[PDB]
Amino acid sequence: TLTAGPGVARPAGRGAAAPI
Amino acid sequence: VPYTGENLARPSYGPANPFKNNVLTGHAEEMYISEATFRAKHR
Amino acid sequence: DFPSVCENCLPENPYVKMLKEDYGAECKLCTRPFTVFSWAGDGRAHGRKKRTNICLTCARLKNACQCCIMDLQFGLPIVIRDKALELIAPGPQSEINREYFAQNNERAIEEGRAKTDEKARELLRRLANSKP
Amino acid sequence: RPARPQIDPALVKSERPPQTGTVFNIWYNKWSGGDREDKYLSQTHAKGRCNIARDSGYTRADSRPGSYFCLYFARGICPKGQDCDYLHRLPTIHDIFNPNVDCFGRDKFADYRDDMGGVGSFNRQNRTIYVGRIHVTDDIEEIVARHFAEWGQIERIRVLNNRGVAFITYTNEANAQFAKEAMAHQSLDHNEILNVRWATADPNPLAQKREQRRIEEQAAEAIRRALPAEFVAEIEGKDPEARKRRKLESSYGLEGYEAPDAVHFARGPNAVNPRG
Amino acid sequence: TPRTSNLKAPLMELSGHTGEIFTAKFDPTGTLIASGSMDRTIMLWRVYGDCENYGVLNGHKAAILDLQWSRDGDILFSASADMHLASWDLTTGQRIRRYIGHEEIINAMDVTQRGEELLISGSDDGTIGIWDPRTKNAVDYIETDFPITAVAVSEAGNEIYSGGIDNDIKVWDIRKKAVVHTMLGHNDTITTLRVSPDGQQLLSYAMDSTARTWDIRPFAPTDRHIRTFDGAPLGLEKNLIRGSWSKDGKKIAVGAGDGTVVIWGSDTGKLLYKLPGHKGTVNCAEFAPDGAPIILSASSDRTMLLGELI
Amino acid sequence: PPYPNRAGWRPRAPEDFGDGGAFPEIPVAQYPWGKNDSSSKSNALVVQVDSEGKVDYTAIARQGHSSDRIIHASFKDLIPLRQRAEAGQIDLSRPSKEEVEATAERTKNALAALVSGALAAQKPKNVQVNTKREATFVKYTP
Amino acid sequence: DVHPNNTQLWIRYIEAELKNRNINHARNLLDRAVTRLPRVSKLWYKYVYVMEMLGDIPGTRQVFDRWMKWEPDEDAWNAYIKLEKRYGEYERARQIFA
Amino acid sequence: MATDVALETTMGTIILELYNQHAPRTCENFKTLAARGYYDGTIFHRVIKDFMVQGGDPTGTGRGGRSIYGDTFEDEIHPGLRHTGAGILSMANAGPNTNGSQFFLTLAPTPWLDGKHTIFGRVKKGIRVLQRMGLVPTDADDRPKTEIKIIRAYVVG
Amino acid sequence: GTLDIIETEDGEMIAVDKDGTFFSTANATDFAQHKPDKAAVDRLVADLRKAEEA
Ligand SMILES: [Zn+2]
Ligand SMILES: [Zn+2]
């Protein structure tokens, strides 16, 4: 009886590189 | 991915200009923190 | 979606509580309704809630803080700046011309299309060798 | 000393104005009906005069820095005194306020009115007030001088007795507004109602030149505070030591170079300068 | 080399939590994802294919702060700040039972992957509870004098890896109910202790922004400390950052408070990756247990980033 | 003066530079073409240069426009595409199903936002109160 | 703004700024005019005539070069050739015939 | 003696002299990278008017750069060589002893790079081309908005 | 530096244009800086007044 929740999956990008 | 760690760990060559924010006064980016942490530091 | 407010105005605490109201007030310069950002103060003696007073278009064109309306570089009242450093931006101030100019500037900035210290140095050169 | 209440609370309340009309408009709170020309010529004497010597004193706002002054103290009508939330004292030359607000904690408009009165404007730095409706006598200068040295720190006191109108130029925004709202419909020695408005700019070329010179010296003061003193001296070009320091520093070898101002007088994170 | 895996996109952003995510774990066959979050909810996703949220588990009365899978991947194990443990069934989406006996907030727990089934809960009253996943009562509990924020089960199934605010990893024995020995050396509050897959190294990140790898092997010198990796500063919040190992035990992935997940090489201490993509602190950084280059980073942006390591 | 003997001899004119390029082994203020000392903020457009190294007068046609705007400003834009000397092989094919679907999703998102705003305009909810007020935290580095 | 492609309005604004010796203003106007309306011969003629009356023969040559870039009618090439024959660079006029 | 190289570009051609007996390491590196076709088809990734034109990255982003002596090598600052004026070559290095392959062709006298940036070359033929390279429209990152490409770079004889 | 003076084998001065920007100010930035003469400005202005008067 596993009901389907409100989650969604969207491909995205990891954004700008960060300095160390 | 833009490689792994080699191009993240190096400086851009050349000297800078002898001569990027978004707000006029400074830089502001959105963030998510717990409201309890904010309340603790505010108090 | 964030005010351009100098550290003179943002009260004391690095952790600040700020309220936002869409169309909360009219701009004091261009008289068009804008988003008001009102914060708290360094004292619970008069709950004035020091707020923004000019819109981000008028904040950006005249380059001044939204709350206190003085310059971001030098900290001058904006007429002192535009009269001593001279030129830069006169800005219309009439009835319909005011909102016309603001409307066109916002329309340009939204559609993508678009040396203060140099004139400060030139001001220093006009004043250093001056004589009444 | 503690601040003294000026009027007992029994006199002041929220009363309806005089019935100058047939029906009271309760939205606009104005007496509609009747003539409209009679209201335009209906000035009245004030209901009290403040004196700083016998009435100023400590209040809750005096212990609070960054507060605002009491407008109802300036008119001499604040009826509580020590327990008023705003300052009860004359502003100094150090009581500097932001251009958005006047000294009384009221919003400050972008242009003046038709009758050049009210709060003020942040589109023109105005330290000069018009004081008209002065009964013509021979000693107008003396009485104006004493009654305006009462209210602060003056720089110019132009008076024109032939028709009896005065221009008073203070030194501060706060003192100018305090003198404006303190003498609003206040009495002179003669039983008259004064007309203390803001003053339109004088067409006298000298006054325009010196107000301009005040604008550039204020800008220069802020710039010299913002810039390093080394930069100010090295640009100023009056000390021969400053000139030869400028040559040697903006040489970097290569005799006869004299680096551009955009590079020599450049402030940045890395920069090429002593910085600071 | 664009993409070498079985995901339908090089990055996927799993969203749908209305509150901060604190943990996220993989099914030990690398096929199912469970994320528990402060909106008191466990969201259950697929990792391969279109990746639908197939399930939601409700029943905790407060914030969820851990969950492990079973041997097969049929029973979930949730610790929550309502002072409770819970065992959940994934055939029906219901709850099997709740485990009661702690008096303060529960920060850690561990299931024995092989050996005999035990749940190991560290809780802020100062207790380490050993539970059997068939009876709600505690089989045993070990008393300390400090809160416990980190817990791991040994390979041999009798040693317990506690980490408290007393700044040192403690290895206890279940039978004698006493500490065997303490690997000290950390300066701040311990957050994660994850054993190496082969079973000879222990990862440990603490509030001092340093992640150290220690020895597990019975033959070791006095100082069992192998290495002190650095390069993942901790942010404003004092969250319990959860690191993990790769399948081959070569890569160390720990989240950081700037939204970036930092991967070092466990062999030498070289920063392999510093992957951005999050706004708030990254709470749970995990590898795929199957050995694929899949990495997951669940952060308190209410989000999870499922990405690749090419 | 060829290599490597220019010591003592200082160039005084751009013809003394050969064809140009300042000599690095003579310490002196060298300018291979001329002096740009100070221009008093001359408000003219900066004369830029096109791809082949010539003056570009399309900077008057493109003024007041964004950089991604298509503006025909030269005679080359009047030539039929086959007869231009740039290329001869052009793919006159519609976008593939993936990128048509991506455009559909982006346009549908934007138009759905405008639909929602318009539906709030044409019939607003009776109360304009949103009591489910969530905070928004902003990291501000001035 | 209301009438962008009107040649009479363009010429009126150029001549109104030429009668008051605003030469730099009027040359900006003429560049904008022959940018907006590249196939109107009157604006190009006015720009070459203004440049020749100001004494800048290299300016007249550069304006004619831009016009010849635009491939105009026969009268424009003829005018350019008559210019170079007036000033005597016959080899330049030969190149223009080429 | 001086050795000549030929940077053929879209906006013109440049013929450069390089000093073998002043800075042998860097100029010999320039020969070896020019003769192999490493600069062929590259992009002048940074142009800043009145200052500098930097280029040499095969990716054209100012990050990488390969020399035949590994990845990096040392610096040679001869006191006789300076940053006298326009049209002078330099190694665009990160810090001390960080010379790679992207080079630095200056546009103005900048005598503050001495002691940090080595000097190894100068331009013979093509200097109005360098003026035009300084006059190209840029972005806020000061990459050229057009395509400045180094098609060819050969030793003249 | 724009014009180069050469002496040929016949023995005469020949000026060779390194650029092509001698006779025309196109492909030359200096066209932005030219100032027309006051006499020519007066001549053009007076011609405009004559056309207006006619
Ligand atoms: Zn405005
Ligand atoms: Zn402010």
CSV table of N, CA, C and O in Angstrom, one decimal, chain G residues 4-38:
chain,number,residue,atom,x,y,z
G,4,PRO,N,10.6,57.5,-38.0
G,4,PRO,CA,12.0,57.2,-38.1
G,4,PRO,C,12.6,57.2,-39.5
G,4,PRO,O,13.8,57.6,-39.6
G,5,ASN,N,11.9,56.9,-40.5
G,5,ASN,CA,12.5,56.7,-41.9
G,5,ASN,C,12.1,57.9,-42.8
G,5,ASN,O,12.1,57.8,-44.0
G,6,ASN,N,11.8,59.1,-42.2
G,6,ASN,CA,11.5,60.2,-43.0
G,6,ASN,C,12.7,61.0,-43.4
G,6,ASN,O,13.5,61.4,-42.5
G,7,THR,N,12.9,61.2,-44.7
G,7,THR,CA,14.1,61.8,-45.1
G,7,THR,C,14.1,63.3,-44.9
G,7,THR,O,15.1,63.9,-44.6
G,8,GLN,N,12.9,63.9,-45.1
G,8,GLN,CA,12.7,65.3,-44.9
G,8,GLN,C,13.0,65.7,-43.5
G,8,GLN,O,13.7,66.7,-43.2
G,9,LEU,N,12.6,64.9,-42.5
G,9,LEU,CA,12.8,65.2,-41.1
G,9,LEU,C,14.3,65.1,-40.8
G,9,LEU,O,14.8,65.9,-40.0
G,10,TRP,N,14.9,64.1,-41.3
G,10,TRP,CA,16.4,63.9,-41.1
G,10,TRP,C,17.2,65.0,-41.6
G,10,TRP,O,18.0,65.6,-40.9
G,11,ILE,N,16.8,65.5,-42.8
G,11,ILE,CA,17.6,66.6,-43.4
G,11,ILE,C,17.3,67.9,-42.7
G,11,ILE,O,18.2,68.7,-42.5
G,12,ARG,N,16.1,68.1,-42.2
G,12,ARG,CA,15.8,69.3,-41.4
G,12,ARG,C,16.6,69.3,-40.1
G,12,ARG,O,17.1,70.3,-39.7
G,13,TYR,N,16.7,68.1,-39.4
G,13,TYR,CA,17.4,68.1,-38.2
G,13,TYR,C,18.9,68.3,-38.4
G,13,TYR,O,19.6,69.0,-37.6
G,14,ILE,N,19.5,67.7,-39.5
G,14,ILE,CA,20.9,67.9,-39.8
G,14,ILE,C,21.2,69.4,-40.1
G,14,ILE,O,22.1,69.9,-39.6
G,15,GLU,N,20.3,70.0,-41.0
G,15,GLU,CA,20.5,71.3,-41.4
G,15,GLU,C,20.3,72.3,-40.3
G,15,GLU,O,20.9,73.4,-40.2
G,16,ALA,N,19.4,72.0,-39.4
G,16,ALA,CA,19.1,72.8,-38.2
G,16,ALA,C,20.3,72.8,-37.3
G,16,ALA,O,20.6,73.8,-36.6
G,17,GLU,N,21.1,71.7,-37.2
G,17,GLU,CA,22.3,71.7,-36.4
G,17,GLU,C,23.5,72.1,-37.2
G,17,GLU,O,24.6,72.3,-36.6
G,18,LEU,N,23.4,72.2,-38.5
G,18,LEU,CA,24.6,72.8,-39.3
G,18,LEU,C,24.6,74.3,-39.3
G,18,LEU,O,25.6,74.9,-39.4
G,19,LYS,N,23.4,74.9,-39.3
G,19,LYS,CA,23.2,76.3,-39.4
G,19,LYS,C,23.8,77.0,-38.1
G,19,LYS,O,24.0,78.2,-38.1
G,20,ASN,N,23.9,76.2,-37.0
G,20,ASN,CA,24.4,76.7,-35.7
G,20,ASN,C,25.8,76.2,-35.4
G,20,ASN,O,26.2,76.1,-34.2
G,21,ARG,N,26.5,75.8,-36.4
G,21,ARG,CA,27.9,75.4,-36.4
G,21,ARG,C,28.2,74.2,-35.4
G,21,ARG,O,29.3,74.0,-35.0
G,22,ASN,N,27.2,73.4,-35.2
G,22,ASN,CA,27.4,72.2,-34.4
G,22,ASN,C,27.8,71.1,-35.3
G,22,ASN,O,27.0,70.2,-35.7
G,23,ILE,N,29.1,71.1,-35.7
G,23,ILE,CA,29.6,70.2,-36.7
G,23,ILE,C,29.7,68.8,-36.2
G,23,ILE,O,29.3,67.9,-36.9
G,24,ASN,N,30.2,68.6,-35.0
G,24,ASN,CA,30.3,67.2,-34.4
G,24,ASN,C,28.9,66.6,-34.2
G,24,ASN,O,28.7,65.4,-34.5
G,25,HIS,N,27.9,67.4,-33.7
G,25,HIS,CA,26.6,67.0,-33.6
G,25,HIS,C,26.0,66.6,-34.9
G,25,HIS,O,25.4,65.5,-35.1
G,26,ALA,N,26.2,67.4,-36.0
G,26,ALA,CA,25.7,67.1,-37.3
G,26,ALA,C,26.3,65.9,-37.9
G,26,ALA,O,25.7,65.2,-38.7
G,27,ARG,N,27.6,65.7,-37.6
G,27,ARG,CA,28.2,64.5,-38.2
G,27,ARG,C,27.8,63.2,-37.5
G,27,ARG,O,27.6,62.2,-38.2
G,28,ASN,N,27.5,63.3,-36.2
G,28,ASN,CA,26.8,62.2,-35.6
G,28,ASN,C,25.4,61.9,-36.2
G,28,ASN,O,25.0,60.8,-36.4
G,29,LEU,N,24.7,63.0,-36.5
G,29,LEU,CA,23.4,62.9,-37.1
G,29,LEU,C,23.5,62.3,-38.5
G,29,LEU,O,22.6,61.4,-38.8
G,30,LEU,N,24.5,62.6,-39.3
G,30,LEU,CA,24.6,62.1,-40.6
G,30,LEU,C,25.0,60.6,-40.6
G,30,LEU,O,24.5,59.9,-41.4
G,31,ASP,N,25.9,60.2,-39.6
G,31,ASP,CA,26.2,58.8,-39.5
G,31,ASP,C,24.9,58.0,-39.1
G,31,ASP,O,24.7,56.9,-39.6
G,32,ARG,N,24.1,58.5,-38.2
G,32,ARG,CA,22.9,57.9,-37.8
G,32,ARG,C,21.9,57.8,-38.9
G,32,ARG,O,21.2,56.9,-39.1
G,33,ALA,N,21.9,58.9,-39.8
G,33,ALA,CA,20.9,59.0,-40.9
G,33,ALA,C,21.3,58.0,-41.9
G,33,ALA,O,20.4,57.2,-42.4
G,34,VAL,N,22.5,57.9,-42.3
G,34,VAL,CA,22.9,56.9,-43.4
G,34,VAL,C,23.1,55.5,-42.8
G,34,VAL,O,23.3,54.6,-43.6
G,35,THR,N,23.1,55.4,-41.5
G,35,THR,CA,23.0,54.0,-40.9
G,35,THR,C,21.5,53.6,-41.0
G,35,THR,O,21.2,52.4,-41.3
G,36,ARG,N,20.6,54.4,-40.6
G,36,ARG,CA,19.2,54.1,-40.6
G,36,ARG,C,18.7,53.9,-42.0
G,36,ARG,O,17.9,52.9,-42.3
G,37,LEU,N,19.0,54.8,-42.9
G,37,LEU,CA,18.5,54.7,-44.3
G,37,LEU,C,19.6,54.6,-45.3
G,37,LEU,O,20.0,55.6,-45.9
G,38,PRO,N,20.2,53.4,-45.4
G,38,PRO,CA,21.4,53.2,-46.3
G,38,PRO,C,21.1,53.3,-47.8
G,38,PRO,O,22.1,53.5,-48.5
